């Protein structure tokens, strides 16, 4: 994968290219107002060390930060999410610590309220593939990257609440 961050809108200004995870981009550019993704699926973060608002991006041109739903022009770390081929599988639970009713999800889910009659998920286990969890249905609101592993409580995925409105598998167009 390859992503280039530009300091000004419209691909202008100083830029920097990243081809792998970068935990602290502060030494390479001071603000980010446009990005070109040449390849790969990436999760961008507002602060270093993969914290703050997160944003998912795939190949394409993004001439302004609103194109990636950015909160502001701060991009201080990024992860290249490994491509997973085959089945994506996660289990969601009604309560924390993997309690209550569990449901297994192996496809994209644009509305957990519509499919499961749930507006909150209190724990989840991602068994295969990486996914992006969205606060609101139809892939809206705050985004959270979920990589394989156990998430015993909402805090584990970085959220300040347990609302989960949709889930998308991280898959490249090809």
DSSP state of 152: -
Q: Given CA atoms 162, 22, 139, 34 in this order, what sign does their dihedral have?
A: positive
φ and ψ at 158, to 5 degrees?
95, 0
DSSP conformational letter for 65: G
Solved with? X-ray
114's enclosing H/E stretch is helix 112-116
Instruction: Give the CA-trace dihedral at 144, 4, 58, 134, to 10 degrees.
Output: 20
**Which domains does the chain possess?**
1-83 (2.60.20.10), 84-174 (2.60.20.10)
β-pairing, 77-80 vs 140-146, is unpaired
Enter the DSSP assignment of 83.
P
Structural contact between residues 169 and 139, judged by C-beta atoms closer than 8 angstroms: no
Q: Which two tokens stand for residue 143?
A: 């985004």
The sheet carrying 140-146 orders its strands as 77-80, 42-47, 51-57, 140-146, 131-136, 166-169
Place of tokens 């009713």: 101
Contact by Cβ (8 Å): 81, 147: yes
Which pair of structure tokens corresponds to residue 49? Answer: 């060390």
Query: Which residue has 């959220």 as its token pair?
Result: 159
**Cβ atoms within 10 Å of 68's Cβ, excluding its own:** 19
């Amino acid at each position: 994968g390859k992503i280039t961050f530009y300091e000004d809108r419209g691909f202008q200004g100083h830029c920097y290219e990243c081809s792998s995870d970068c935990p602290n981009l502060q030494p390479y550019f001071s603000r980010c107002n446009s990005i070109r993704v040449d390849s790969g699926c990436w999760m961008l973060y507002e602060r270093p060390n993969y914290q703050g608002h997160q944003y998912f991006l795939r190949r394409g041109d993004y001439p302004d930060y609103q194109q990636w739903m950015g909160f502001n022009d701060s991009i201080r770390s990024c992860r290249l999410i490994p491509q997973h081929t085959g089945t994506f599988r996660m289990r969601i639970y009604e309560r924390d610590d993997f309690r209550g009713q569990m449901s297994e999800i192996t496809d994209d889910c644009p509305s957990l309220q519509d499919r499961f009659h749930l507006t909150e998920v209190h724990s989840l286990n991602v068994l295969e593939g990486s996914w992006v969890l969205y606060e609101m249905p139809s892939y809206r609101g705050r985004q959270y990257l979920l990589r394989p592993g156990e998430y015993r409580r909402y805090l584990d995925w970085g959220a300040m609440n347990a609302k989960v409105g949709s889930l998308r598998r991280v898959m490249d167009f090809y």
